[PDB]
Amino acid sequence: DKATIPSESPFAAAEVADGAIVVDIAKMKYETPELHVKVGDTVTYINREAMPHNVHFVAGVLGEAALKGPMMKKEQAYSLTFTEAGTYDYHCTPHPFMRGKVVVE
Ligand SMILES: [Cu+]
């Protein structure tokens, strides 16, 4: 796998690390739909709205299997640590018109 998962559970927005790079989710959009990070960085998604959201990378993107993240309730967060350069597209499972990408460089 080209990413590791610190927490399989979502966790509270207050529990977000220092140093993680935050992507907020609100108004049915990922607020930073194109994020550029370095190898080794942790990206933390934070749901800021009532609608539950996840991030979903299809098979072959972050590793062999699809990475279907857990649903985040409002004010919950979920992190991924990227270990290899590349472009990693994702979408929201229930709302697949929501799309973003992480470019690791
Ligand atoms: Cu969503």
Element holding 21 (H helix, E strand): strand 21-26
CATH (domain of 11): 2.60.40.420
**What is the span of the domain harbouring residue 7?**
1-105
How was this structure determined? It was done by: X-ray
C-alpha 101 to ligand 1 mean position (Å): 14
* Dist. CA 29–CA 5, nearest whole Å: 22
C-alpha 6 to ligand 1 mean position (Å): 21
Residues in the chain: 105
| Structural domain count of the chain | 1
Q: Which residues surround ligand 1, an ion (CB under 5 A)?
A: 53, 92, 95, 98
Quick one: the chain helix, strand, coil %, rounded to 5? Answer: 5, 45, 50
**Of 53, 51, 102, whose CA–CA distance to 77 is shortest?**
53
Question: Looking up tokens 């559970």, which residue turns up?
Answer: 9
